[PDB]
Amino acid sequence: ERLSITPLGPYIGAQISGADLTRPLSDNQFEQLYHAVLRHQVVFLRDQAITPQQQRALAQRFGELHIHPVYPHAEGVDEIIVLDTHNDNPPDNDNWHTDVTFIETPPAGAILAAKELPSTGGDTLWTSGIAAYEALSVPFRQLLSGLRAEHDFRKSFPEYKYRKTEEEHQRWREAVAKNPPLLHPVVRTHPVSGKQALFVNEGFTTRIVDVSEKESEALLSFLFAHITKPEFQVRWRWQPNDIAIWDNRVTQHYANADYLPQRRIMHRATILGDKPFYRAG
Amino acid sequence: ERLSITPLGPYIGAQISGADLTRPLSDNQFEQLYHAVLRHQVVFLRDQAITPQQQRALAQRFGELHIHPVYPHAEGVDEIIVLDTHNDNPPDNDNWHTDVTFIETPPAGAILAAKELPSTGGDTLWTSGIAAYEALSVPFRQLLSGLRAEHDFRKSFPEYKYRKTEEEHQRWREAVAKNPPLLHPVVRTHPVSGKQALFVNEGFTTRIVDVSEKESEALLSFLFAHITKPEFQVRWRWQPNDIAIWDNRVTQHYANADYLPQRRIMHRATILGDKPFYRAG
Amino acid sequence: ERLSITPLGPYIGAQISGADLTRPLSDNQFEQLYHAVLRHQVVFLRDQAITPQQQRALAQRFGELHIHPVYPHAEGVDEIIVLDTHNDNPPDNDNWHTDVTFIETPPAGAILAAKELPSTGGDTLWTSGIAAYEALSVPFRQLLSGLRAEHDFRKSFPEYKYRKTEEEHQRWREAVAKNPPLLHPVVRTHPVSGKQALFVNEGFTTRIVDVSEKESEALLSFLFAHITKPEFQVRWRWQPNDIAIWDNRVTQHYANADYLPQRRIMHRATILGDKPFYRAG
Amino acid sequence: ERLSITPLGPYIGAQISGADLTRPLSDNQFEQLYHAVLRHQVVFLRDQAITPQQQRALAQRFGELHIHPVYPHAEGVDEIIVLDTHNDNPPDNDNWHTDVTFIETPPAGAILAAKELPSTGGDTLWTSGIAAYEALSVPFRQLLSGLRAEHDFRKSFPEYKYRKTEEEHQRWREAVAKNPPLLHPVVRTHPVSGKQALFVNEGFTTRIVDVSEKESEALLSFLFAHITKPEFQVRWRWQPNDIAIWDNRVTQHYANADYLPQRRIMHRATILGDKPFYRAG
């Protein structure tokens, strides 16, 4: 069966129907779905009442999945993380970020399923690093290509938010010790498509190390604004049993925090990635 | 008939059905539509195949309408402006702005009808000055309340873009002479609801005159970024015969320029406004 | 003897003669010196061939002395910092800072003596927090008055600069434990003159806690630039045996790093102040 | 006679004695003065009781002189600007600028003489475009080299400052007509030494035309701040009959406005340069 794929804009986003994600997909179907994620960077399917087991199986056709000990997981399925936000667990994703870029091999992508939603709010936005790179002037494309930038766990999890108790402070210290800052290319080459994408994000990028500190502040301030250009984005208003699949190698996203005290439950499968690299054009 | 009103988020935006905009509305219907625009700041109705005459009549129930000599208007209807963009007439609304704030009485609102659309692209976004004001810390709310800022035609229409011919340059000079910069409150009190809203926009606001030049640059740089927070916004993907009605007193908007060389035709009715003022809380 | 006092500008700085600082001063001379420091914020005395022992003795007349947790001290004189810079110890004070604001009672004064100088370069600049406050617009004065900001030893002494050896990393660890981050007023009231002064500095101030994170970044970016205005400053070109004495309650300073591979040796004494406070007025 | 030349820093500034500038200099002395200006970028000579006529004569030895379109000149000496400031003519040069970069052949040099000074205040600072360029990272040097920027007379002489009378508004109108905006290289190659220097200045540079508007704002904001680094500068405290001679190809300067209501009178001569160019290297 041919999938129905409707682009949501010229640069990023598509809505897909004609694929039952609870049951196994044919190879032709999955090839279409795969290439649609590659091309449109994030795709959305609706009315997909998927179990954590079916979501794991779907995600595993893209690649192997992250398992966390720190987060709660679905009953009987370790690869599906339960993101259950409310007053006692406020959301922390209302900032432009690429997931876990402070490790050497950030996730290649994710599958996110909406399980329980507030009456309104909680939109999620994606922005295209490819479109943003292509919109830079030639001098800026030549400048940023080949530079390296530092990504640091502590930019999104700063020490001053973990002082409340001595145990909490020490747990933060241990996480920092396990996750020292490291470098990634400022312009990342997609390992399948070969497209060039900006690969800095306000969530974790602290410094472009191949320019001076003041030069870095100027460039990152510009770039963190540049990626907020509406032309580079798609915005999704969730309904229950929506599924979002996105490529974390060449996008950032932002999850609105505008629904507390209401409750919101998402199920996530994180697809493991490889080391980001830059291959000159 | 009671209107069906679906909010699109907790702070701004709603989709409305149950009102035929081609034919006259009952008073009860219009009271609902009016209060929904007031509350949700921008509202969207779909499948409204409205003629310019019917759009004028609808808009005139909100207030009297702007007539321009400079723009093309619909056949036989001067109050409906035809916005026909393409290669020879590129779009210029891809910047965060409040319409015509460089005059003493900026429009109170607008009704926009989608007539011909590109295959994809051309989304329009709105951001809430009310939500943005309420999200400032107390020191910033106290700081900005009562200040005045200069709005200048030339910020969106700078001289260097009008040098191509001597006639074009002189036409710009004449427009500038008719439209000198003037002041508006930084925090505007809505004249009906009494809500306080940020009332600066990157399109036209050049300087907060009650602080120093460097202080102004710092504050406006922060504020122009602050209003781009996704929680303050709604984003609309157009279909033909969509109608958008919005309150220009307490919002900004941004029209994506991501569809050239394709053609896009909108019909607009501009509702005249009064002088912005600030009334302390 | 009456002191000879020549102002170097309208807001900050004076050159003084008529006092031999290498030998005991009369109570009358000392009162004159003390009030000149308060009035001119930084004063300079030339041709003063002082020993570290004599420099400590003079500093003791102003109050109780501070022992720095990281910097090396002079042989047998624990209270005198030796700033001995060269290829093997590159300069560390080419940033705008107020000395030791990371403690509860930041130094009220300091005394600096030029011991060995390069053939050229190494100028030191002072900027007046009083002049900087008075140059703020009234709305900005009202904004900052009453706000508090965090000061952190580690901002100017980051861990990665102290990992060359176990000795220096352990000394760093002990300094951090004794000097946790703390708050000081953003506008400080001088305890003698009653004048208001800006009291943040880029060396140690990390964030303003009474506003949002993005608001804090905007305000500190402005303030760190504001104090670099030339009208707020005096610039000193050193000769051997110069002495500078300054009011560290209401100034910042900056030491040029433009002389390597040449060697430069200064001696500093550091006089504890009271707890900084703000008293509205 | 051999000139006595004392450098004031490693990068910029020297004090000179052994030359009477009020009387004719030997070709040998002149060569020494000329090469000192090139080597030290700005030089200072004290106790030089020069007349405007003598100052013009000395300036003529360097090249053809410029007559300023707006500033008043000395009686009977059209080439000597009188900068006579006080309550009725407040100072106008407390901004970082390179003199008269709004013409095709900006002055290569200038000569400033202190005629009447306030009791204190009014220091003038110079900053080196050569030092500032060398402090850029290689990627930033490569970025800016070859770019062009627009310079506009009106940035420092805006119309609203010249509407007090019809005479001054008409003089402004004629200056604008004779001095339209034009481009200069962002990195300028010194025509004698071959050194590269930054060649933008906040006084007249409006935008970098080879990048986007937002990219231009980011780069100019960085560059206008970069040149204020103290290591790039020399600061001069005037005495009557001082003379400053500087290489206006590769420096900027800034005149403190901190002495009103006291009166200050300086005389300037301004020597035309060649067309600024960039030669890669």
Swiss-Prot record, chains A, B, C, D:
Pathway where it operates: Organosulfur degradation; taurine degradation via aerobic pathway; aminoacetaldehyde and sulfite from taurine: step 1/1
Keyword Metal-binding among UniProt keywords: yes
Enzyme class (EC, first level): oxidoreductase
Binding residues for 2-oxoglutarate: 124, 253, 264, 268
Residues that hold taurine according to the record: 68, 71, 93, 100, 268
GO MF entries: ferrous iron binding; identical protein binding; L-ascorbic acid binding; taurine dioxygenase activity
Disruption phenotype: Disruption of this gene leads to a loss of the ability to utilize taurine as a source of sulfur, but does not affect the utilization of a range of other aliphatic sulfonates as sulfur sources.
Cysteines engaged in disulfide bonds, as pairs: none
Cofactor binding note of this UniProt entry: Binds 1 Fe(2+) ion per subunit.
Catalysed reaction equations from the record: taurine + 2-oxoglutarate + O2 = aminoacetaldehyde + sulfite + succinate + CO2 + H(+)
Industrial or biotech use: Taurine dioxygenase can be used for enzymatic determination of taurine concentration in food quality control, biological research, and medical diagnosis.
The protein's role, per its UniProt record: Catalyzes the alpha-ketoglutarate-dependent hydroxylation of taurine yielding sulfite and aminoacetaldehyde after decomposition of an unstable intermediate. Is required for the utilization of taurine (2-aminoethanesulfonate) as an alternative sulfur source for growth in the absence of sulfate. To a lesser extent, pentanesulfonate, 3-(N-morpholino)propanesulfonate and 1,3-dioxo-2-isoindolineethanesulfonate are also desulfonated by this enzyme in vitro; however, desulfonation by TauD of organosulfonates other than taurine seem to be of little or no importance for sulfur metabolism in vivo.
Complex and partners: Homodimer. Was later shown to be a homotetramer arranged as a dimer of two dimers.
The protein's name: Alpha-ketoglutarate-dependent taurine dioxygenase
Gene encoding the protein: tauD
